[PDB]
Amino acid sequence: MKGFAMLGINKLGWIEKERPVAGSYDAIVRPLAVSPCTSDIHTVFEGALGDRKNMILGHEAVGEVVEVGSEVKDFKPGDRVIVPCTTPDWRSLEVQAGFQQHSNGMLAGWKFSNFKDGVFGEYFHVNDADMNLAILPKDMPLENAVMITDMMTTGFHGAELADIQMGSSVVVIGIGAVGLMGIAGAKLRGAGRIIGVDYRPICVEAAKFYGATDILNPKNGHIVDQVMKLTNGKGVDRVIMAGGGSETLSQAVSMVKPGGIISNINYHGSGDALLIPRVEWGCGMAHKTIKGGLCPGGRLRAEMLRDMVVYNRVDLSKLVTHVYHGFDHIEEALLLMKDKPKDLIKAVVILH
Amino acid sequence: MKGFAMLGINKLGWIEKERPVAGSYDAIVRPLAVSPCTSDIHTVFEGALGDRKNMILGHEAVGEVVEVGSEVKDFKPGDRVIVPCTTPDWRSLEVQAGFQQHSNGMLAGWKFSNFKDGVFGEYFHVNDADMNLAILPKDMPLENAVMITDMMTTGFHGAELADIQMGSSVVVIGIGAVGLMGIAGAKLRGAGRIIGVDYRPICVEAAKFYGATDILNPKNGHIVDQVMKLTNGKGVDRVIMAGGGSETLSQAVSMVKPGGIISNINYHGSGDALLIPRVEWGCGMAHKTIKGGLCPGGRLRAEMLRDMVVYNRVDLSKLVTHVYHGFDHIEEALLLMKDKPKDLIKAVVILHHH
Amino acid sequence: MKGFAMLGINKLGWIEKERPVAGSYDAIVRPLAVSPCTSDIHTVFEGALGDRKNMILGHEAVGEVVEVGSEVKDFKPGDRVIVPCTTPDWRSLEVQAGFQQHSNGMLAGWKFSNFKDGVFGEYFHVNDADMNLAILPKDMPLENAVMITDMMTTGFHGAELADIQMGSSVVVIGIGAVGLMGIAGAKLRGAGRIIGVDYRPICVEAAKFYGATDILNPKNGHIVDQVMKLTNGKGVDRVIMAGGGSETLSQAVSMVKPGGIISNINYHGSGDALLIPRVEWGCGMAHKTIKGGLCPGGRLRAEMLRDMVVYNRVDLSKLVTHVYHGFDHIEEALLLMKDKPKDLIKAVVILHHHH
Amino acid sequence: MKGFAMLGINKLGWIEKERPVAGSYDAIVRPLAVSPCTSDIHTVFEGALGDRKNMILGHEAVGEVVEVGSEVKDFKPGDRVIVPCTTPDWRSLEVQAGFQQHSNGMLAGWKFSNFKDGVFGEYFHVNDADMNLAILPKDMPLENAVMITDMMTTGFHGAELADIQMGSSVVVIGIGAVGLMGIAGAKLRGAGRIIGVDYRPICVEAAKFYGATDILNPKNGHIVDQVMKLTNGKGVDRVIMAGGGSETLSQAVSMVKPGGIISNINYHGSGDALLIPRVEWGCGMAHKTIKGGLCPGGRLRAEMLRDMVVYNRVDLSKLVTHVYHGFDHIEEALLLMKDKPKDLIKAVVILH
Ligand SMILES: NC(=O)c1ccc[n+]([C@@H]2O[C@H](COP(=O)([O-])OP(=O)(O)OC[C@H]3O[C@@H](n4cnc5c(N)ncnc54)[C@H](O)[C@@H]3O)[C@@H](O)[C@H]2O)c1
Ligand SMILES: NC(=O)c1ccc[n+]([C@@H]2O[C@H](COP(=O)([O-])OP(=O)(O)OC[C@H]3O[C@@H](n4cnc5c(N)ncnc54)[C@H](O)[C@@H]3O)[C@@H](O)[C@H]2O)c1
Ligand SMILES: NC(=O)c1ccc[n+]([C@@H]2O[C@H](COP(=O)([O-])OP(=O)(O)OC[C@H]3O[C@@H](n4cnc5c(N)ncnc54)[C@H](O)[C@@H]3O)[C@@H](O)[C@H]2O)c1
Ligand SMILES: NC(=O)c1ccc[n+]([C@@H]2O[C@H](COP(=O)([O-])OP(=O)(O)OC[C@H]3O[C@@H](n4cnc5c(N)ncnc54)[C@H](O)[C@@H]3O)[C@@H](O)[C@H]2O)c1
Ligand SMILES: [Mg+2]
Ligand SMILES: [Mg+2]
Ligand SMILES: [Zn+2]
Ligand SMILES: [Zn+2]
Ligand SMILES: [Zn+2]
Ligand SMILES: [Zn+2]
């Protein structure tokens, strides 16, 4: 089979590979629609997770089951499925402690395009189908369902980690796709004021749609001063770090109130340092909690978010600004995430 | 001053009373708009909180400050305020443990028409004005703002106590005003499926507006079987008890999954004991947590809910089906809560103004 | 093989049964030491969980692995293991939500002598060996190690559900073996005052050892009034329900403060009603949270409690008052739990495999 | 009255001062025993909290009430009291949100020797006596009781923020007085393995007393390698940062497991920034939560910790290595915290 792969660091290309075979508890899936993620750009062109050889990329897909192992009981060939980007090994001690994302190692619940061939191929492999797949509703648009696999679960996890209260003020730094879902998720945890911080105009209309009450552009002043001006010097209750470089941590600490929470869902791949400013952190005693986590996956998470979409708790269509048709456009779409034209949020490639 | 009072158990009426005077840290407030609560029907006609003599009723009001004590620093006469129904004494050991609602005693954070003259008078008294009042925005409709003081904070507390997750399935038993904010709150905590249980048609359209995805009527079959049929025998993640008798706890325990949470905000005014169905509670070992709490009050809560309204997170106007103009209609409005016509959710009395 | 079984309701006896075989992920264990639980007396003589026929009893054992399935990777024949009484199925949606105890159904994590042949036999079956077993330290006395599997994990779960704070006052109702570990667990969560409620003298000394600061006897006065007298009318922050009848729930609600937490680990097997007293529950608005749960099992829990014993955080030997030697004494030991002589807390039967 | 004060940065001295007068809700207290804190050395000689002029130092005291305001109801002159180092303003919006320590500002619940004349004087002022004092039990040694006001509440808060579970493995970095109470607190939250990190033998012996199962000395190797060797490369569940430089945060992140919690109770007085190591933090996605908080105060905290001492849950006497008798020795004791002989844990000055 053909697949679009990281040959090595700074090298992309189509490769031929043997089709994966399903173990007793696994499924082989054919993609129906996929989306590129900025995490693959960090991975390929920055070596943020180390070096790889012939690793098929991509981890956002909805697909059709083509083969199942003899012990798979809830899915069969022909079933259409939402595939969460995180597919844990459920029999691990980390699962017993409540951390499916790190089953058998740090980030090891995220396999696709981390250390396992991803979804940019004619077929891909899902471990433990009954625990890690969910049925795609018959009338749900493919582009919407692909947004569940990563953008929605990651952005909402930012809001869950932030422990938002009814009426909390929230700053979301970085209003790309993940930050837009952080804004939506904060609204769905009861946030009052939500300030988005970014410089891209396409995201402003989407950010307001999902629930932003204020938009700040760093280009017209240092952002902490801008936030202090908006909040009369009081700061905000919660900060979600969804995009930008490592210096946003220092910004988040400086704008959150004592007792507040900072929630990172941004993947920090770069040579910039994550620095906590000492004085604004109350010399370590200001109860400014800092969290950061890989998104949950598995069947339960996927089915619960699927129900949110089905009952219209969030309209995911606003994330998808570009739609391509055909394997041939996977390369162009991924390179789009590297260059980022001003009007791109997420791109979806539809396979026929 | 004039006030509408509980004369005793089973007796309502207008009374004349001396005006309250503010202590050094208190405010005297004038109502601008008020609403009757079903809890006052429990208090007066069931003696659910004991006996009272000439207690002015009501605890849902927005008003104008007319007088403040010498140590009040953030409010002055003329300020228009949202008055939370719960107004705690903030200097207590219960406050140090995080339970403002019970500062200096069980439920003692709720004073108005519990053991303190309430808001159905020409003036009423608010303890610790700086800690217990919030400014009413100039452009907020009065009838919407009165819904903050009790319905919203109670309904949202129900959803807060339920510890809802992104996509949790939720049943709300009782879709009166409080349950409607339970539905709204559950949606604003990320609930997926929301099943409302009630028999009153007026609440059906409001429930759908606030986020209900299914509506069950108990009159056409035992409600647990109905929920089991909707959920393929699996039950739901969370139950909020917002209305009905003591038997709703048994229904909630029976329809919630093992590991789930039951969140009671219903004020149970009759019966000696609430019954836990033993087998459906896993004989005590099914991890079906049971909670129940008085709504939070105080300035911080009121300002945070106010911000939710100001930023259009919830539209409170759908709660208000009846609006009167004039102080004197407090009597008719409260009596409406006793008789409950088919089309009532909440009534607001707006006092005459220019 | 021989196994000590519930022949029917009200009938105990030895039966011959096929020796279990392990599936690919399972282990077969030979018991080295076992303990009878009061719940098995309830099952046989009260039919509290329904009717069973020829179910081998017992769910407290440490043992030796004799056979493992072809996919077992961390345990091998010859390993000595602690077997938690709760051995969940780990591949379920309830596990993904964090409730191992109810994987694939309410209380379905408790298999032994619930709906699965238990440990009172020559061999028994453990599902998912890699997820549900823990290595027994070579120098840990067997009778101590058996107390981990049920008594320690249940009592400590009572203290965990109670969400104790540094200095909380705690009442533990029923200071049998489980309540004794409830006392120990409460101390190990930072409790200040710990009031034990019981009438059995043997438990009083153990209760003081494990951390009780006061002991109240229900027989000489209404306990709620007694607790109010001890606390100058203020009540307590937390209640752990570990023994007694269904009426202890109402008593717990009446003695806990507003905002407090009641934690049930007592299995209410009788048809007596569980009642929340309305006025003392603030008519539903007093923030008196009621929790209740089956004890966690699995490898991680067993290893974490094992480390606590190894590092001397709790001395389990005070639970064991009776030690037998020989498979034959299982009947006598189990019947001891039915009658409960004045000097019994827990009994352990030590097995001596031979030809 | 006389008091030992921070004249400015790098200037200590005795000053003459007016005796404070109690407002309607306050108490004036005469100290019976006091203790110097390392935090005062940060404040004076590092200017960690800004500049001060003639601020009386000290915030660990037990005393006798000599005067109360007209509205004080539970305390009267002659009462002997434990005075928590944190004495919040209880009527603030931060109290309504559950953060007494930051009432009316970051760290502002801690007044003594922060921005209020402290306890190293003949008298000092306690705001809101009914809310901020606790009765000293008749039979409690004074030197033990002084350890409640700061060392016990701070160390235990470290264990509380750490969210310890029954059997959690815990590393405590820095085994001075606060770290010793972190060890004691971790044990009283049910920790199994407790690893103490320090190089001072007296603190090692005390750490074993309070519950440490292993002791690591930084002098025989990088402590992360040592912890990884002790845990066969698995790491620990929880880390409490109780002493050391800013780099201890990086060390904590490297030794804690994915999903673990790092709890800072160390007052960081120097440096611009604390660095979070990127890869060891899972590039932001390892669910390694970082907390850090000023100790709780107020009457309820002091009474609950007092009950723990009365019921022998913790023996505080092992904290006290140096005892002076006489007001005159306040200067010598505080300078001891600056020099720190190898066998010092805490010093107490007993006043007559
Ligand atoms: N597979 C996974 O586990 C996973 C999934 C989703 C996201 N992530 C990570 O989360 C992050 C979010 O993804 P995305 O698609 O939103 O990224 P993105 O490329 O859209 O960047 C986010 C936004 O932040 C803005 N930004 C850049 N610098 C900024 C600054 N200094 N201040 C404020 N805003 C700034 C950019 O304009 C951009 O719109 C990514 O870095 C990604 O690697 C990982
Ligand atoms: N102390 C306070 O401040 C406070 C605040 C809010 C609410 N409360 C209490 O909360 C409760 C809710 O108040 P409300 O204004 O919604 O009352 P309500 O009169 O609207 O009653 C709620 C609804 O529940 C329905 N119901 C009755 N029996 C039922 C059953 N067996 N199953 C299902 N549904 C049933 C009724 O049809 C009604 O429409 C009240 O009992 C009130 O006392 C107290
Ligand atoms: N299935 C399981 O895994 C499991 C595990 C542990 C415990 N449990 C359940 O937990 C309970 C604890 O068992 P145990 O071994 O401690 O039983 P036990 O026989 O030791 O009984 C506990 C104590 O409660 C006392 N008591 C009786 N009535 C009382 C009252 N009114 N007030 C206060 N105390 C009273 C009894 O005298 C006894 O002292 C059992 O009922 C059991 O069913 C179940
Ligand atoms: N708000 C308050 O008043 C308050 C309360 C409690 C604690 N604190 C702060 O908490 C800290 C506690 O100080 P203490 O007196 O308990 O301890 P301490 O002053 O003895 O210092 C901790 C010890 O750890 C050791 N150490 C140094 N570097 C290390 C490293 N890299 N790894 C391991 N160990 C190392 C040193 O021997 C040092 O003495 C202080 O810095 C203090 O400022 C402040
Ligand atoms: Mg970015
Ligand atoms: Mg479109
Ligand atoms: Zn991604
Ligand atoms: Zn009301
Ligand atoms: Zn048992
Ligand atoms: Zn200090």
Q: Dihedral sign, CA of C54, C60, C65, C66?
A: negative
The ligand placed nearest to the CA atom of residue A179 is 1
Which protein residue has the closest C-alpha to ligand 3 atom 32? C244
> What residues contact A56, with CB distance under 8 A and at least 6 apart?
A3, A4, A5, A15, A17, A113, A117, A118, A119, A120, A121, A124
Amino acid sitting at position A120: F
Atom of ligand 1 nearest to the CA of A110: 3
Say how far apart CA B286 and CA B281 lie, in whole Å.
6
Q: Are residues A169 and A203 in the same domain?
A: yes
Say how far apart CA A281 and CA A279 lie, in whole Å.
5
Strand ranges (DSSP E) for chain C? 2-8, 11-16, 27-35, 55-56, 60-68, 80-83, 124-126, 134-135, 170-173, 194-197, 214-216, 236-241, 256-264, 274-277, 289-292, 320-325, 346-350
Q: Are A227 and A216 in contact (CB under 8 A)?
A: yes
Q: Is D169 on the interface with C (CB under 8 A)?
A: yes
Residue numbers after which chain C breaks, C to N beyond 2.5 angstroms:
none
Ligand 3 center–CA C337 separation, angstroms: 11
> What residues contact A138, with CB distance under 8 A and at least 6 apart?
none
Ligand 9 center–CA C137 separation, angstroms: 22
Q: What angle, 0 to 180 degrees and rounded to 10, lies between the N-to-C axes of helices B153-161 and B298-310?
A: 100
**Of B122, B150, B115, B140, whose CA–CA distance to B28 is shortest?**
B122
The Cα-based distances of B341 to B59, B199, B337, D318 in angstroms read 22, 13, 8, 72
Task: Pick left, alpha or beta for residue D62 (phi over 0 → left; psi -120 to 50 → alpha; otherwise beta).
Answer: beta
Q: Are residues C116 and C178 in the same domain?
A: no
Say how far apart CA A255 and CA A234 lie, in whole Å.
8
Q: Is A26 on the interface with C (CB under 8 A)?
A: no
**Of C213, C25, C286, whose CA–CA distance to C132 is shortest?**
C25
Three-class SS of residue A167?
coil
- Tell me the chain A residues in contact with residue C301 when contact means C-beta distances shorter than 8 Å: 96
Say how far apart CA C304 and CA C82 lie, in whole Å.
12
Q: Are residues B128 and B218 in the same domain?
A: no
DSSP code string of C220-272 = GS-HHHHHHHHTTT--EEEEEE-SS-TTHHHHHHHHEEEEEEEEE-S---SSP
Task: Test B278 with C246 for CB contact under 8 angstroms.
Answer: yes
Per DSSP, helices labelled H in B9-133 are 38-46, 93-96, 129-132
Interface of D with B in 195-214 (CB under 8 A): none
**Of C8, C4, C15, whose CA–CA distance to C46 is shortest?**
C8
Q: Are residues A4 and A143 in the same domain?
A: yes
Ion ligand 5 neighbours (CB, 5 A) are A 243
Q: Is D307 on the interface with C (CB under 8 A)?
A: yes
Task: Test A300 with C97 for CB contact under 8 angstroms.
Answer: yes
Q: Are A193 and A337 in contact (CB under 8 A)?
A: no
DSSP code string of B265-309 = -----S-SEEEEPTTTTGGGTB--EEEEBPPP-HHHHHHHHHHHH
Q: Bridge-partner residues for C28, per DSSP?
A: C67, C125
Q: Are A51 and A6 in contact (CB under 8 A)?
A: no
**Of C109, C114, C115, C111, whose CA–CA distance to C94 is shortest?**
C109
Residue A60: domain span = 1-154+293-352
Q: What angle, 0 to 180 degrees and rounded to 10, lies between the N-to-C axes of helices A177-187 and A201-210?
A: 20
Three-class SS of residue D343?
coil
Q: Are B7 and B54 in contact (CB under 8 A)?
A: yes
Ligand 8 center–CA B71 separation, angstroms: 29
CB atoms within 10 A of CB D317: 10
Q: Enter the tokens of residue B48.
A: 């659910």
Q: What angle, 0 to 180 degrees and rounded to 10, lies between the N-to-C axes of helices C223-230 and C248-255?
A: 20
Q: Enter the tokens of residue D251.
A: 């060390």
The Cα-based distances of B166 to A185, B14, B149, D203 in angstroms read 9, 49, 27, 47
Amino acid sitting at position A235: G
**Of D154, D200, D156, whose CA–CA distance to D175 is shortest?**
D200
Say how far apart CA C35 and CA C346 lie, in whole Å.
7
**Of C235, C183, C233, C242, whose CA–CA distance to C207 is shortest?**
C183
Q: Are B266 and B295 in contact (CB under 8 A)?
A: no
Residue showing tokens 């991680």:
C300
Q: Dihedral sign, CA of D46, D52, D53, D54?
A: negative
Which protein residue has the closest C-alpha to ligand 3 atom 29? C244
Q: Is A228 on the interface with D (CB under 8 A)?
A: no
Q: Are residues A189 and A252 in the same domain?
A: yes
Task: Test C299 with A130 for CB contact under 8 angstroms.
Answer: no
HSE-up of D308 (CA within 13 Å, CB side)? 31
Q: Enter the tokens of residue B208.
A: 């759908």
Task: Test A166 with B187 for CB contact under 8 angstroms.
Answer: no
| Domain finish residue from D244, D262, D292 | D292
Q: Are residues D124 and D188 in the same domain?
A: no
Q: Are B61 and B143 in contact (CB under 8 A)?
A: no
Mode of pairing for the β-strands spanning C55-56 and C27-35: unpaired
Q: Are residues C145 and C189 in the same domain?
A: no
Which protein residue has the closest C-alpha to ligand 2 atom 11? B266
Instruction: Please give the helix or strand (H or E) that residue D65 lies within, else none.
Output: strand D60-68
> What residues contact A232, with CB distance under 8 A and at least 6 apart?
none
Mode of pairing for the β-strands spanning B80-83 and B55-56: unpaired
The ligand placed nearest to the CA atom of residue D107 is 4
- Tell me the chain D residues in contact with residue B131 when contact means C-beta distances shorter than 8 Å: 91, 96
DSSP code string of C132-146 = H-EEPPTTS-HHHHH
HSE-up of D28 (CA within 13 Å, CB side)? 15
Say how far apart CA A104 and CA B138 lie, in whole Å.
57
Q: Is B130 on the interface with D (CB under 8 A)?
A: yes
Say how far apart CA A128 and CA A95 lie, in whole Å.
14
DSSP code string of B326-342 = SGGGHHHHHHHHHH--T
Query: What does the angle CA D169 – CA D172 – CA D174 come to, to the nearest 5 degrees?
Result: 165
> What residues contact C292, with CB distance under 8 A and at least 6 apart?
B281, B282, B284, B285, B286, B287, B288, C161, C241, C263, C264, C265
Q: Are C196 and C239 in contact (CB under 8 A)?
A: no
Q: Enter the tokens of residue D261.
A: 């919690």
Burial of A312 (0-12, 13-18, 19+ CB in 10 A): exposed
CB atoms within 10 A of CB C81: 24
**Of B252, B318, B327, B336, whose CA–CA distance to B286 is shortest?**
B252
| Rg of chain D taking only CA atoms, in angstroms | 20
Say how far apart CA B141 and CA B147 lie, in whole Å.
11
Phi and psi torsions of C181, nearest 5°:
-70, -25
The minimal CB distance from B96 to the residues D91, D97, D299 is found for: D299
Three-class SS of residue D31?
strand
Which protein residue has the closest C-alpha to ligand 3 atom 1? C39
Task: Test C307 with D166 for CB contact under 8 angstroms.
Answer: no
HSE-up of B117 (CA within 13 Å, CB side)? 24
Which protein residue has the closest C-alpha to ligand 3 atom 26? C244
Say how far apart CA B49 and CA B45 lie, in whole Å.
11
Q: Which residue in chain A is spatially nearest to C304 when comparing CA positions?
A: A97
Q: Enter the tokens of residue D275.
A: 């660095």
Q: Enter the tokens of residue A202.
A: 């396409």
Q: Are residues C10 and C115 in the same domain?
A: yes
Q: Are D345 and D180 in contact (CB under 8 A)?
A: yes
Chains that touch C (3 or more CB pairs under 8 A): A, B, D
Q: Enter the tokens of residue C240.
A: 């752990």
Phi and psi torsions of C340, nearest 5°:
55, 80
> What residues contact B123, with CB distance under 8 A and at least 6 apart?
B1, B19, B20, B28, B29, B30, B66
| Domain finish residue from B271, B292, B313 | B292
Q: Are residues A252 and A321 in the same domain?
A: no
Q: Is D97 on the interface with B (CB under 8 A)?
A: yes
DSSP code string of D95-114 = HHTT-GGGTTSTTTT--BTT
The Cα-based distances of D325 to D1, D144, D287, D352 in angstroms read 19, 15, 50, 8
Say how far apart CA B323 and CA B143 lie, in whole Å.
8
Three-class SS of residue B48?
strand
Three-state SS letters, A219-280: HHCCHHHHHHHHCCCCCEEEEEECCCCCCHHHHHHHHEEEEEEEEECCCCCCCCCEEEECCC
Q: Bridge-partner residues for B275, per DSSP?
A: C275
Q: How many CB pairs under 8 A join C and D?
A: 76
Q: Enter the tokens of residue A141.
A: 């648009």
Ligand 5 center–CA D11 separation, angstroms: 48
DSSP code string of D198-218 = -S-HHHHHHHHHHT-SEEE-G
The number of folded domains in chain A is 2
Amino acid sitting at position D93: L
Say how far apart CA D157 and CA D164 lie, in whole Å.
11
| Domain finish residue from B242, B272, B292 | B292
Ligand 3 center–CA B111 separation, angstroms: 41
Three-class SS of residue C98?
coil
Say how far apart CA A141 and CA D100 lie, in whole Å.
50
Q: Is C299 on the interface with A (CB under 8 A)?
A: yes
Q: What is the DSSP letter of D219?
A: G
Mode of pairing for the β-strands spanning D55-56 and A134-135: unpaired
Mode of pairing for the β-strands spanning C256-264 and C236-241: parallel
Burial of D138 (0-12, 13-18, 19+ CB in 10 A): exposed
Burial of A149 (0-12, 13-18, 19+ CB in 10 A): buried
Q: Are residues B84 and B227 in the same domain?
A: no
Amino acid sitting at position C125: H
Q: Bridge-partner residues for B286, per DSSP?
A: C293
Ion ligand 10 neighbours (CB, 5 A) are D 37, 39, 150
Q: Dihedral sign, CA of C173, C174, C176, C177?
A: negative
DSSP code string of D233-299 = T--EEEEEE-SS-TTHHHHHHHHEEEEEEEEE-----S-SEEEEPTTTTGGGTB--EEEEBPPP-HH
Amino acid sitting at position D114: N
Among C263, C285, C290, pick the best mutation site for testing chain B contact (most B Cβ within 10 A): C285
Say how far apart CA D132 and CA D83 lie, in whole Å.
7
Say how far apart CA A272 and CA A249 lie, in whole Å.
11
Q: Are residues A145 and A13 in the same domain?
A: yes
The ligand placed nearest to the CA atom of residue A322 is 6
Residue numbers after which chain A breaks, C to N beyond 2.5 angstroms:
none
Resolution for this model in angstroms, one decimal place? Answer: 2.2
**Of A221, A214, A220, A291, whose CA–CA distance to A252 is shortest?**
A291
Q: Are residues B178 and B283 in the same domain?
A: yes
CA distance B60 to chain D (A): 21
Task: Test A95 with C91 for CB contact under 8 angstroms.
Answer: no
Decide: C179 in ligand 3 pocket, CB within 6 A: yes
